[PDB]
Amino acid sequence: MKASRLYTLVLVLQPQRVLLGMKKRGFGAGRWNGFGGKVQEGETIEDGARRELQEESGLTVDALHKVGQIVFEFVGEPELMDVHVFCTDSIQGTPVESDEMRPCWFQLDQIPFKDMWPDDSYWFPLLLQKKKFHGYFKFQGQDTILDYTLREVDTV
Numbered sequence: 454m455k456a457s458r459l460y461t462l463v464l465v466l467q468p469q470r471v472l473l474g475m476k477k478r479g480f481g482a483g484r485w486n487g488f489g490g491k492v493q494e495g496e497t498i499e500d501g502a503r504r505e506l507q508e509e510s511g512l513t514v515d516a517l518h519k520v521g522q523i524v525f526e527f528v529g530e531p532e533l534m535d536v537h538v539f540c541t542d543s544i545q546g547t548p549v550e551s552d553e554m555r556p557c558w559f560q561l562d563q564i565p566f567k568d569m570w571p572d573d574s575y576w577f578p579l580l581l582q583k584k585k586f587h588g589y590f591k592f593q594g595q596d597t598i599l600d601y602t603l604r605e606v607d608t609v
């Protein structure tokens with residue numbers, strides 16, 4: 454059995470567009486991604502998600518809703534990434550570039566899948582249909598999925 458580390462991922466999903474951030478450095482740099490990072494000691498997962506959204510995009514929200522959970526395994530890394538995925542209830546400010554992320558709005562017929570993590574092609578359509586999900590993806594490196602599982606659930 455493996456240990457897992459808690460991460461968050463936040464999608465600001467509005468009726469016709471979604472906010473994504475171009476990762477400027479670190480893990481997954483060069484790909485569009487939701488906003489998020491490691492959960493810190495003391496905070497709930499949801500509060501860590503709100504904190505990372507504020508740090509990385511400038512947006513301050515009072516509440517998120519859980520939409521999914523995805524476990525990532527990487528060849529050669531024993532620690533799993535346990536990623537808790539959230540969507541915003543509402544927003545009330547503008548996105549701002551941070552050192553980690555450059556935010557940009559994408560229309561929902563222009564989701565930039567080819568420049569996102571490959572797993573997003575599988576689970577992001579469920580998020581768009583407002584369906585909750587559990588996923589697991591094993592990667593060789595950054596590009597190649599060796600095994601994956603994706604299941605719709607009633608409760609995340």
Ligand SMILES: Nc1[nH]c(=O)nc2c1ncn2[C@H]1C[C@H](O)[C@@H](COP(=O)(O)OP(=O)(O)OP(=O)(O)O)O1
Nearest residue numbers: 460461462479480488489490491525536570572573
């Ligand atoms: N395969 C994948 N697909 C995806 O859509 N998002 C992934 C992913 N693998 C990791 N992520 C996301 C989860 C989380 O939001 C982020 C990884 O955490 P980060 O390294 O961004 O954490 P931090 O922002 O704390 O890092 P620092 O800013 O360096 O402290 O990338």
Ligand SMILES: [Mn+2]
Nearest residue numbers: 489490505509
């Ligand atoms: Mn961060």
Ligand SMILES: [Mn+2]
Nearest residue numbers: 489490509553
């Ligand atoms: Mn981050």
Ligand SMILES: [Mn+2]
Nearest residue numbers: 489490491505
């Ligand atoms: Mn962080």
